[PDB]
Design a binder for these strands. Structure first.
Ligand SMILES: [Mg+2]
Ligand SMILES: [Mg+2]
Ligand SMILES: [Mg+2]
Ligand SMILES: [Mg+2]
Ligand SMILES: [Mg+2]
Ligand SMILES: [Mg+2]
Ligand SMILES: [Mg+2]
Ligand SMILES: [Mg+2]
Ligand SMILES: [Mg+2]
Ligand SMILES: [Mg+2]
Ligand SMILES: [Mg+2]
Ligand SMILES: [Mg+2]
Ligand SMILES: [Mg+2]
Ligand SMILES: [Mg+2]
Ligand SMILES: [Mg+2]
Ligand SMILES: [Mg+2]
Lengths: 129, 80, 205, 82, 150, 123
RNA sequence: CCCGCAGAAGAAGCACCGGCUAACUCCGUGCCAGCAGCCGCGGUAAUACGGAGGGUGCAAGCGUUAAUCGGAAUUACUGGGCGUAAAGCGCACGCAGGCGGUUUGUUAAGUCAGAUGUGAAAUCCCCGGGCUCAACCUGGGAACUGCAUCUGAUACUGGCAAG
RNA sequence: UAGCUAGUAGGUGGGGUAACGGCUCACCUAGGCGACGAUCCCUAGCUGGUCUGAGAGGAUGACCAGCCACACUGGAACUGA
């Protein structure tokens, strides 16, 4: 938004699915995709397209199961002026491991799993679930 | 070598000495939030070739004066 | 102490036989199973959601003859030792030299046994022991003192040791009056319908 | 005047001393540099019961560790050469 | 195995022309050891005549939960009206740890060992369903890979 | 609130007022008994209860109640303040421990004798 | 500490039972006497005052007081609210301060990783020994969020350069 | 309590301490500290730790151990590592 970008992103999706929306959109950004991969490649979205070599556009194709949405439990965390950082023995574990928390480790951003799997900490992001 | 610090020579109205307020960060021991701080020291500059609005690294050493225990090591930035 | 008073009057405030006084008849008359535990036997003591854990208390408690404090120390630790804190408690209440010695035919009533141990008349794993609240670990070489193997108590007692649902978690041969705690009394084998889903709550407040 | 002396740390009647390298003018068992082994005065033959960390002893005597009597006796009392 | 236990029985009244009247209220829930729960609520001019209505309405119109071995699994937390409740999975041994309603509504809902606590008001007729609301979201560890994976 | 909104002035505890001034950590203090009287209750109650204005050792003269039936409490008779307030008695935030110093315990009280003052009936 | 010696012998009390709260009856009293942590008890049939009968709970102790934390998410980072319940300055401008669209390069300070000194011992805790047990005593390890230093990582944050 | 401070902040040379230094003296510059809260007022020995608590947090610093300070009150130096 007119301050913190990513914040809006996580919202856009949670909002859309809230009203069985097709697929919300937002101006794509390198960090936006790094968090996008951990969605399509982590089972949470169909896929994301692009548009604009100079004026990009992210496209998170939401999903829904039986009679409810898929990604129905997302929230930001390491927001500005409150950024959170934790060590390996502090790493998160979204909803008792049942969920996932995007973590921007020194070795690229990746799901909570790859965090311990790779053995290292990173800028915790959201609590996808 | 120590570690030094690219502090700010806020003061220079002294001789062979200059008050410098070093910027610092730290997480709140409760609410947890990176906050800026300051470290005003009485550096020493025999030749007094620093200047205000500038930027220099300071190093601790023998107690030169009552409060002045640091000396100038280099002037990274300067001008105004 | 340990109540040291009327056992039946106390068993009424519970109903289900809490062992204690036995080796003869008891129950069905000669006790008044919930007929008049005090004076208002008729007036139904409709307990509350709290009354349970509390009324339950006296059972898993008085049945073994213990105080209120000594019990807590047990439970509190009954949580420390890894594993289901629930049953992890009954175990200690079992290894107690009280029920142990008693459950091997020695003495008719646990209290009758508490006297034996207290009077040096009891021996275990070689060296003598006269302290009831002694955590009797398994494999020990328990046996009555040969300095009184033939007295009377243990005699007219070891007899009903047969009727007592032969314990599996251990092996006791009335022969020379010796026995060894095989292994922990896994809840199940502990012939009791007692509900412990309270003992863990009433003390978890 | 650093040295390896003894410091009582056992319950009443049943004392459990603790040899440690400390200063001469030091209290009973307070200020101390480093605890080198101990000594339990009981019995019943429990394999061991009175270590000492021989190797640590020498580590200090090199300077001026005024190892007192009893403690010095420990070195001997225990297999110093075994 | 339909377990049924009372939750609360207040009096409740109302004033009128001639004078005033009363309609005792009965709160009750239902469920089976498996993991089903179905609360209710009724009232009448008598403690019993009302207690029955409550249960009946309870035994009917119910929902099931993905109850695990005996406790729960993920951080359950259901809210309703003026009351916030939180339920945590208590490992085997630690019996059901709850206060008022949130207690009775569990020793019959299947859950044997669990430690939970509220935050908002203590109003029973509100805290009860507040617990169910949590179960309502209590999904199982499996099936997730189905909704997301491929 | 806002994190920074706190960094300026972090939350603070509301210093609870000790409803027992003539306390000073002391669970009880001796007395002097400035005078003893018989006042009336609040509003919903009646009957003239017994109260007394005893002067503490720290000069914190205050008033106390005299539980139990009857009392030998005279005037210069010293007593040991207990504490604990009352309802019908306004201000009275202390009670006189019976069976101690000068004040004698209740008479013929064969129940809850710990209070007041009665050392065993007659065995 | 062990043996022997008479002989149940020398060794039970305290609080509570109107609701929270386990535990009820009968008398005496009659807004008097008195009870009372809160709501409140008593103005002739008190489970609430006093005694007894009984019961309930504790135990060589029980109860009252005093004092801290808990409950109290009731100062709320975890973990709170502000339309009407307490709560948006009457409104603007704006310094400091806090926050910062997007891409690349660089830096590596925040941060993450590993190494090292160091964070006394003793409490604590895990396992395990010594007192007949326990209290207590004791071995080893874990732990000691920490501080700094060395070398690496570069996703995000910050700095610089170019937009 | 919103201002505070002349041996005050720094610089030269003498002097001094076991040793750095306004530590002290002479002279010189006119600094130094402060809302990231100085100065002032009330209170308190500090820590490991202790109590409570799910944890974070709150309360506390008796006995054991490390550190500091004090020795009728105010002041001072002598001996001596
Ligand atoms: Mg309805
Ligand atoms: Mg409330
Ligand atoms: Mg009080
Ligand atoms: Mg009741
Ligand atoms: Mg009374
Ligand atoms: Mg009457
Ligand atoms: Mg709190
Ligand atoms: Mg509020
Ligand atoms: Mg208002
Ligand atoms: Mg306005
Ligand atoms: Mg330590
Ligand atoms: Mg950058
Ligand atoms: Mg000089
Ligand atoms: Mg003082
Ligand atoms: Mg709490
Ligand atoms: Mg003096």
């Amino acid at each position: 938004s007119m301050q913190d970008p990513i914040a809006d992103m996580l919202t856009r999706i949670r909002n859309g699915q809230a009203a069985n929306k097709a697929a919300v959109t937002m101006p794509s950004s390198k960090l936006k995709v790094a968090i996008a991969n951990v969605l399509k490649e982590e089972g949470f979205i169909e896929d994301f397209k692009v548009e604009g070599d100079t004026k990009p556009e992210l496209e998170l194709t939401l999903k829904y199961f039986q009679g409810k949405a898929v990604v129905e439990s997302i929230q930001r965390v390491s927001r500005p002026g409150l950024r959170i950082y934790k060590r390996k023995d502090e790493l998160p574990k979204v909803m008792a491991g049942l969920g996932i928390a995007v973590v921007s480790t020194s070795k690229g951003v990746m799901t909570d799993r790859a965090a311990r799997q790779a053995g290292l900490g990173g800028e915790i992001i959201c609590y996808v679930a | 070598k120590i570690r030094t610090l690219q502090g700010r020579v806020v003061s220079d109205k002294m001789e062979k000495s200059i008050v410098v307020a070093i910027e610092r960060f730290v997480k709140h021991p409760i609410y947890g939030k990176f906050i800026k701080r300051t470290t005003k020291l009485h550096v020493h500059d025999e030749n007094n070739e620093c200047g205000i609005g500038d930027v220099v690294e300071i190093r601790e050493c023998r107690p030169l004066s009552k409060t002045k225990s640091w000396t100038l090591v280099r002037v990274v930035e300067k001008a105004v | 102490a340990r109540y040291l008073g009327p056992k039946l009057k106390l068993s009424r405030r519970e109903g289900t036989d809490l062992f204690l006084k036995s080796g003869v008849r008891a129950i069905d008359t000669k006790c008044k199973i919930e007929q008049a535990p005090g004076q208002h036997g008729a007036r139904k003591p409709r307990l509350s959601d709290y009354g349970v854990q509390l009324r339950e208390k006296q059972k898993v408690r008085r049945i073994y003859g213990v105080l209120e404090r000594q019990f807590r120390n047990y439970y509190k630790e009954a949580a420390r030792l890894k594993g289901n804190t629930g049953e992890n408690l009954l175990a200690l209440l079992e290894g107690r030299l009280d029920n142990v010695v008693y459950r091997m035919g020695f003495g008719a009533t646990r209290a009758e046994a508490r006297q034996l141990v207290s009077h040096k008349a009891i021996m275990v794993n070689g060296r003598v022991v006269n302290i009831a609240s002694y955590q009797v670990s398994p494999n020990d070489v328990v046996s009555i003192r040969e300095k009184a193997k033939k007295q009377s108590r243990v005699k007219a007692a070891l007899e009903l040791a047969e009727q007592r649902e032969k314990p599996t978690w251990l092996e006791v041969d009335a022969g020379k009056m010796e026995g060894t705690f095989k292994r922990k009394p896994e809840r199940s084998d502990l012939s009791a319908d007692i509900n412990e889903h309270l003992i863990v709550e009433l003390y978890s407040k | 005047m650093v040295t390896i002396r003894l410091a009582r740390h056992g319950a009443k009647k049943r004392p459990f001393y603790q040899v440690v390298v400390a200063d001469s003018r030091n209290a009973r068992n307070g200020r101390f540099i480093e605890r080198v082994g101990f000594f339990n005065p009981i019995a019943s033959e429990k394999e061991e019961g009175t270590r000492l960390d021989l190797d640590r002893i020498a580590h200090w005597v090199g300077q001026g560790a005024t190892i007192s009597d009893r403690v010095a006796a420990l070195i001997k009392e225990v297999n110093k050469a075994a | 195995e339909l377990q049924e236990k009372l939750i609360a029985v207040n009096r409740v009244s109302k004033t009128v022309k001639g004078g005033r009247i009363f309609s005792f209220t009965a709160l009750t829930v239902v469920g089976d050891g498996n993991g089903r729960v179905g609360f209710g609520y009724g009232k009448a001019r008598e403690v019993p005549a009302a207690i029955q209505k409550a249960m009946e309405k309870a035994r009917r119109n119910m929902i099931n939960v993905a109850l695990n071995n005996g406790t729960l699994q993920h951080p359950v937390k259901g809210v309703h009206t003026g009351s916030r409740v939180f339920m945590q999975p208590a490992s085997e041994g630690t019996g059901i740890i709850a206060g008022g309603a949130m207690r009775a509504v569990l020793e019959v809902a299947g859950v044997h060992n669990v430690l939970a606590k509220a935050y908002g008001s203590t109003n029973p007729i509100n805290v009860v369903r507040a617990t169910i609301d949590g179960l309502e979201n209590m999904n199982s560890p499996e099936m997730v890979a189905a909704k997301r994976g491929k | 609130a806002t994190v920074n909104q706190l960094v300026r002035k972090p939350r603070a505890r509301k210093v609870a007022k000790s409803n027992v001034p003539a306390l000073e950590a002391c669970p009880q203090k001796r007395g002097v008994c400035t005078r003893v009287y018989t006042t009336t209750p609040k509003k919903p109650n009646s009957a003239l209860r017994k109260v007394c204005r005893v002067r503490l050792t720290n000069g914190f003269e205050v008033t106390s109640y005299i539980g139990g039936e009857g009392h030998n409490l005279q005037e210069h008779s010293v007593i040991l303040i207990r504490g604990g307030r009352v309802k019908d008695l306004p201000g009275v935030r202390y009670h006189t421990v019976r069976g101690a110093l000068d004040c004698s315990g209740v008479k013929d009280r064969k129940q809850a004798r710990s209070k007041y003052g009665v050392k065993r009936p007659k065995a």
